Amino acid sequence: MYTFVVRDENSSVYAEVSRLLLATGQWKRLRKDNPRFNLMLGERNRLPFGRLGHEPGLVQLVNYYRGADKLCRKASLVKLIKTSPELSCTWFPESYVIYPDEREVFLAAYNRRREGGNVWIAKSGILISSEASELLDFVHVIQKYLEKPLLLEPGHRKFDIRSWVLVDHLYNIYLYREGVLRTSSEPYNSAQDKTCHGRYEEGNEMFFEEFNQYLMDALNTTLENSILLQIKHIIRSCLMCIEPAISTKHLHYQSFQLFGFDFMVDEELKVWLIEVNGAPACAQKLYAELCQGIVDVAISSVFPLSIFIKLHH
Amino acid sequence: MEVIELNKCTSGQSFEVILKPPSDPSLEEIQKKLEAAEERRKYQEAELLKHLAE
Amino acid sequence: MREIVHIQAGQCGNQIGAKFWEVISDEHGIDPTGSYHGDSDLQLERINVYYNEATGNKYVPRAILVDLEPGTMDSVRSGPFGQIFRPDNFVFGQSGAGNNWAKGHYTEGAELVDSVLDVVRKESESCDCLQGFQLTHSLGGGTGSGMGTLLISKIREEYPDRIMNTFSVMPSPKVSDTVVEPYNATLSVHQLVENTDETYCIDNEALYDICFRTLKLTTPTYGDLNHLVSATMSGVTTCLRFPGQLNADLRKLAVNMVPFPRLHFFMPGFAPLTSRQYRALTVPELTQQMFDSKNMMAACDPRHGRYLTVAAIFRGRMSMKEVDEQMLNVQNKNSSYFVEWIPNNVKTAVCDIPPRGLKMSATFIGNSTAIQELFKRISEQFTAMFRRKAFLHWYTGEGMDEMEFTEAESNMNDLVSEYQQYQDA
Amino acid sequence: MRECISIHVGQAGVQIGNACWELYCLEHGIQPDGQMPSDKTIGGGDDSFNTFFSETGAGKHVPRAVFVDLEPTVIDEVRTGTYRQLFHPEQLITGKEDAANNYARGHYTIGKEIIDLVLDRIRKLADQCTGLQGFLVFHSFGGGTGSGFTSLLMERLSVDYGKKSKLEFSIYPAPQVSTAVVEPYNSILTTHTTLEHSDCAFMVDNEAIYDICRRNLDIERPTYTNLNRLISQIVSSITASLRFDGALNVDLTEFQTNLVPYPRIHFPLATYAPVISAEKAYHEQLSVAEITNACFEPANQMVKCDPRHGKYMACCLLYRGDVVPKDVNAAIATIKTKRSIQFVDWCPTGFKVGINYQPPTVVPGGDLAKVQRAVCMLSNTTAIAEAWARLDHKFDLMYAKRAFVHWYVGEGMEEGEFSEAREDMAALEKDYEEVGVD
Ligand SMILES: CC/C=C\[C@H](C)[C@H](OC(N)=O)[C@@H](C)[C@H](O)[C@@H](C)C/C(C)=C\[C@H](C)[C@@H](O)[C@@H](C)/C=C\[C@@H](O)C[C@@H]1OC(=O)CC[C@H]1C
Ligand SMILES: Nc1nc2c(ncn2[C@@H]2O[C@H](COP(=O)(O)OP(=O)(O)OP(=O)(O)O)[C@@H](O)[C@H]2O)c(=O)[nH]1
Ligand SMILES: Nc1ncnc2c1ncn2[C@@H]1O[C@H](COP(=O)(O)OP(=O)(O)CP(=O)(O)O)[C@@H](O)[C@H]1O
Ligand SMILES: Nc1nc2c(ncn2[C@@H]2O[C@H](COP(=O)(O)OP(=O)(O)O)[C@@H](O)[C@H]2O)c(=O)[nH]1
Ligand SMILES: [Mg+2]
Ligand SMILES: [Mg+2]
Numbered sequence A: 001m002y003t004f005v006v007r008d009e010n011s012s013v014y015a016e017v018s019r020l021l022l023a024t025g026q027w028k029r030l031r032k033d034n035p036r037f038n039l040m041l042g043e044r045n046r047l048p049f050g051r052l053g054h055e056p057g058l059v060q061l062v063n064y065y066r067g068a069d070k071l072c073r074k075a076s077l078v079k080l081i082k083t084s085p086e087l088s089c090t091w092f093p094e095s096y097v098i099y100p101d102e103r104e105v106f107l108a109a110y111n112r113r114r115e116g117g118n119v120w121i122a123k124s125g126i127l128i129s130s131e132a133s134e135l136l137d138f139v140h141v142i143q144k145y146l147e148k149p150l151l152l153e154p155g156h157r158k159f160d161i162r163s164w165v166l167v168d169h170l171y172n173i174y175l176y177r178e179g180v181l182r183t184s185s186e187p188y189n190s191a192q193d194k195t196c197h198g199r200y201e202e203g204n205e206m207f208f209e210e211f212n213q214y215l216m217d218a219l220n221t222t223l224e225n226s227i228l229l230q231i232k233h234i235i236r237s238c239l240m241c242i243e244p245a246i247s248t249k250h251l252h253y254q255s256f257q258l259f260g261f262d263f264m265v266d267e268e269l270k271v272w273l274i275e276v277n278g279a280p281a282c283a284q285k286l287y288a289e290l291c292q293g294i295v296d297v298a299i300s301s302v303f304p305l306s307i308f309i310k311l312h313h
Numbered sequence B: 001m002e003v004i005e006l007n008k009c010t011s012g013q014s015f016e017v018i019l020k021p022p023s024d025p026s027l028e029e030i031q032k033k034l035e036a037a038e039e040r041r042k043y044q045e046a047e048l049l050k051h052l053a054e
Numbered sequence C: 001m002r003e004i005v006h007i008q009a010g011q012c013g014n015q016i017g018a019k020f021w022e023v024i025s026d027e028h029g030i031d032p033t034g035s036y037h038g039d040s041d042l043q044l045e046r047i048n049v050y051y052n053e054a055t056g057n058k059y060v061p062r063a064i065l066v067d068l069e070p071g072t073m074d075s076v077r078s079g080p081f082g083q084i085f086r087p088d089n090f091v092f093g094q095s096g097a098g099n100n101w102a103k104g105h106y107t108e109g110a111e112l113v114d115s116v117l118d119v120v121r122k123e124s125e126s127c128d129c130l131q132g133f134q135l136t137h138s139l140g141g142g143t144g145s146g147m148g149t150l151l152i153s154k155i156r157e158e159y160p161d162r163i164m165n166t167f168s169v170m171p172s173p174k175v176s177d178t179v180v181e182p183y184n185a186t187l188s189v190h191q192l193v194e195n196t197d198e199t200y201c202i203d204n205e206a207l208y209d210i211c212f213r214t215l216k217l218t219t220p221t222y223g224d225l226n227h228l229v230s231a232t233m234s235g236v237t238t239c240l241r242f243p244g245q246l247n248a249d250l251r252k253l254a255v256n257m258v259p260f261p262r263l264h265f266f267m268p269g270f271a272p273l274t275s276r277q278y279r280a281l282t283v284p285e286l287t288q289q290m291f292d293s294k295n296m297m298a299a300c301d302p303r304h305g306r307y308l309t310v311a312a313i314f315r316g317r318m319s320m321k322e323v324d325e326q327m328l329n330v331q332n333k334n335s336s337y338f339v340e341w342i343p344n345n346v347k348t349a350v351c352d353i354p355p356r357g358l359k360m361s362a363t364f365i366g367n368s369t370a371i372q373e374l375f376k377r378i379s380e381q382f383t384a385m386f387r388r389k390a391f392l393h394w395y396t397g398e399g400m401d402e403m404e405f406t407e408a409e410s411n412m413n414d415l416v417s418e419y420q421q422y423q424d425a
Numbered sequence D: 001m002r003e004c005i006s007i008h009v010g011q012a013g014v015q016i017g018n019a020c021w022e023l024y025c026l027e028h029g030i031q032p033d034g035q036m037p038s039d040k041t042i043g044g045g046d047d048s049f050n051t052f053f054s055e056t057g058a059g060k061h062v063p064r065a066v067f068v069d070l071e072p073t074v075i076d077e078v079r080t081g082t083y084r085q086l087f088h089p090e091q092l093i094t095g096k097e098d099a100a101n102n103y104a105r106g107h108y109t110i111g112k113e114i115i116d117l118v119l120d121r122i123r124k125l126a127d128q129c130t131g132l133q134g135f136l137v138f139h140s141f142g143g144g145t146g147s148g149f150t151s152l153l154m155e156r157l158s159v160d161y162g163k164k165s166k167l168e169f170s171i172y173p174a175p176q177v178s179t180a181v182v183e184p185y186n187s188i189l190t191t192h193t194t195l196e197h198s199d200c201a202f203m204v205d206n207e208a209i210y211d212i213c214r215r216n217l218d219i220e221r222p223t224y225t226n227l228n229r230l231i232s233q234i235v236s237s238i239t240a241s242l243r244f245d246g247a248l249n250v251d252l253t254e255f256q257t258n259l260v261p262y263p264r265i266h267f268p269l270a271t272y273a274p275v276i277s278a279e280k281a282y283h284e285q286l287s288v289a290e291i292t293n294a295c296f297e298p299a300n301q302m303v304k305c306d307p308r309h310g311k312y313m314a315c316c317l318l319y320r321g322d323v324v325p326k327d328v329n330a331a332i333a334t335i336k337t338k339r340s341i342q343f344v345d346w347c348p349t350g351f352k353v354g355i356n357y358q359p360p361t362v363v364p365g366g367d368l369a370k371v372q373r374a375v376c377m378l379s380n381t382t383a384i385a386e387a388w389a390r391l392d393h394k395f396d397l398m399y400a401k402r403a404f405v406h407w408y409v410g411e412g413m414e415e416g417e418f419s420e421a422r423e424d425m426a427a428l429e430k431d432y433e434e435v436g437v438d
């Protein structure tokens, strides 16, 4: 009999995962603070990694990588990419860390665009301004705004791509074969109105099945070639960079973690990384399949009782 | 990398490698605590014997 | 040396005591005449805990036999190991206690108690470093119950900084001698709550069910029940009688087992419990049944409560790694029944020497809140009679007043409530 | 030459002390009878090994040690063991009944009655020193004597020897091998009371030692003997600089100067490699780079924690055997690129290195194979605060219900001392947070 604990009642994914664990008969849910557990579904913040792996005779596994925050915090991701020789970088928009610090390095690269597209976005409440004035007056990161996004037709509308990535205790990198495009059902206005920056598709989200069909009909290419190669590359690059810092290969406890990678595609079919979510939700139609894959690949692999693409390294 | 302060002898050697620069209770007080605890033990014991005498 | 002074009082106390010494004497290689004849030096290393060494390398149990009538102690003196006891350590009267707590505690017992204390003093003053005392007795009779608890109060008065340990046989109507047993047991339990550091609760009902249901003994006798107890007593004291690290003396055992001063009543268990057989027993089998209710001798279902602390002692050549595997296993498979606010509250010890005739055995000592069921049973039987003042005249005739019964009833119900508090925590 | 006096308190401290002095004699060529053919300074001399051994006119090299335990059985091993001739009765101090795993009993009840005698014995050793530099105190956290009496002794040593340094070797409790459930209480109580009196404390978690013995030595159920032989190797590599010619960590003060910039944060993490089973006939002799890289594997640490998620304040590399500075530097440059080694901003990102050419000595018939090179890394990292957090959590679980507290109050301790000690620990955890978190 295997035991697990739930320490984030507010999680959609792992509420379904615990449901599957119980629906197998070989898993027993314990109290929140029972230390004699095999698997912890931990809290998002202040997870006590220091108390894991000290129960005699218990192999313990947690659903979060200690240190993964450096990838999933906007400020620390900008710093990670700039300060990491592995990344230094063509797929990440020009960004700067500025506290209310790279305040000066930003202005240097800014005016040399005003004197010579010079729209930026400030986020961490978002602000998209063409002039640095209201951007600086508004820890935050200032990022170059993709002024040439790939627009879906009909609608002439913007979108982003969510890719779910599961990394197991062996630091294998798995990409869920099902992604989601989250479209803005308003025509992309080019000239402060933050709504285009279920008319066409249900729930304003388009799956790979349809998006790949559009790319073939509209652009005579495929999702795999024009976009998926770049997404797989970006995922590997990001996760391999921090592997020495967060791996639990020879650690007294083991971690896995599900990530939400957010990408954007410009009109040249170039993919840009937007951010990495450390506690992502899932698409309603994809909850059952993804949550079962988590149990199969991340949990049952450690505690014995493909929908993933394995990014090799 | 920089190796400094290399001391050598027949038993071995030592040195320092730098990769980056930077950026009480008195005796009387203790006796009081010990005797206060002894007093509390003696008080608890005396209560017990008073309880047993009843 | 860390000497323990043993006292057995009343019929039940002396009969179980007689068997206990028979059993451990054999384990330590002592014949009925007090001469050592063992093959292993492990038998003599801590033999001073229970035996004095007399002239000629003779070993005399540091045991004191007490009773208000001579019958049982005459049987002991004519028993198998009867001649091994010190003749001066037989202290007995003639009147008897009539299954009357008041007689043992206030009248008949009072006449005799000073002479027992003289013997206790003689054994104690001869100890290089006395740990404390262990008393064997029943709570349902008069001598063991009434005079036994009187002795405990007297001993604590003269030795207030010593550990007081008892093996107490709890009455049950299924195996009953007199209807007044709930009265005597209720009066004794209050005494034990106040004046003992550890009390092993032995329920005759559980002992009977074990002999009948598990061991397939059609009609169990007191002799059968008493061998279970002596076997159990041998296991729980193995840590004290042989080299080891866990619960090696009375005080350390109490510090590890008693988180709250009044909740010091333990449920013991023994394995193997098998019917007539030569099959080599495995560690999972020892562990499985030792933790099964049917192998526990308090007639309380631990799944009805929660364990505060648990000590498990394994005996015989075995793989201690497999011991840990099974021990750590049963906690995870019974997680609901261990309190989470006492970390690592299940301790395990392993002793090389197994009891005679057994390749391996396991003894269990649990401090479970389920023991409240045992006190609740006693309380209900007490109140069933007290609300009609039934049989009270036997006690008021010895000078007791009804208020002392009411007070004993209140103290009992308070003890139950205290257990309920921690079963919900 | 400045003498060092070792004090061993309780079962853990005594049995580990006996293991260390056996290893010392083997390292210095001192026979069980105290004779040392190497010492031409018959009856005297102030060589490096004399910091730990005095000398009698008959040529016996006597440890500068005192053994204290409130129960006789463990110290009788000393006066009856292989190296019994080494010690004289004045060095062995024994009581009759122990602290029963009760800090209050070791500190107040029994400690009050034996402290002067212990001090008298220590004074006798100190009177024999031309320039005593301090004390090395071995003890457990969990034992009633190791916790309770040690903290009292440390308080008195600060009174009677104000200028002297005090270092600790402390056994952090592990349920895998411990029998008492109250050990979290004793650990916090003794840490609170000893904190301002210790200049540098090396914690050893029995869990780490136990696992290293199972994994690297292939011992299915390690015993105290297995654990102590390994612990004594770690202690030896740490004290080698006091006992052999050298220039790093040559006296007790240099331990605090090199490892403890913040006085309260005085618990360096120890990591040791290689640990190799003597049953393995041939093992590939690891290189300087390999054993140095092993110093950054949690599996080789005396306390299991993750230094990647803390910050370093100081780092010391102690090598024994065939090691040359060239290879150490090559190894360091390599690891700095492939490891997460974040120093605090107000400390230099560097390593103090010491090499002693004598390879580690092993006890004949032990479980540890003789290697040609070994290393012990002493790093003051905030990651070791994980050990405090774990311990404090177990404290909180029991103390919220006041479980077992009556045993302590019964010996004359006030309940207030529990909360006082716990608050001191919460502040200690805050200091680590304040130092190691961006
Ligand atoms: C009744 C079946 C007999 C033996 C079975 C097979 C097991 O024996 C073996 N070898 O496994 C027993 C351990 C059994 O489980 C227990 C219940 C025995 C028990 C304590 C009490 C019984 C109730 C009594 O009637 C008792 C007078 C009967 C027999 C005892 O003489 C047995 C001896 O008791 C020991 O204490 C150690 C050596 C064992 C020789
Ligand atoms: N590594 C190691 N740990 C030990 C040894 N002996 C005891 N321990 C640990 O120390 C703790 C128990 O405390 P002890 O040192 O035995 O007790 P003590 O200091 O003698 O104090 P009292 O016996 O209570 O008077 C437990 O965590 C044991 O695991 C030993 O020889 N080596
Ligand atoms: N540099 C950039 N250029 C153009 N559009 C951008 C951009 N950065 C962000 N966006 C747009 O802003 C939206 C939200 O940005 P961001 O992801 O940082 O906010 P968020 O974290 O609250 C949503 P999520 O958690 O799902 O990633 C994205 O869907 C993207 O379309
Ligand atoms: N297990 C066991 N119980 C006994 C024995 N003798 C008596 N009892 C129980 O003890 C109670 C009677 O007490 P008893 O010891 O005979 O009275 P006492 O001699 O005055 O102390 C009843 O509950 C009996 O069931 C015995 O030999 N073994
Ligand atoms: Mg986000
Ligand atoms: Mg009778």
Ligand SMILES: [Mg+2]
Binding pocket: D010, D011, D069, D071, D098, D143, D145
């Ligand atoms: Mg001890």
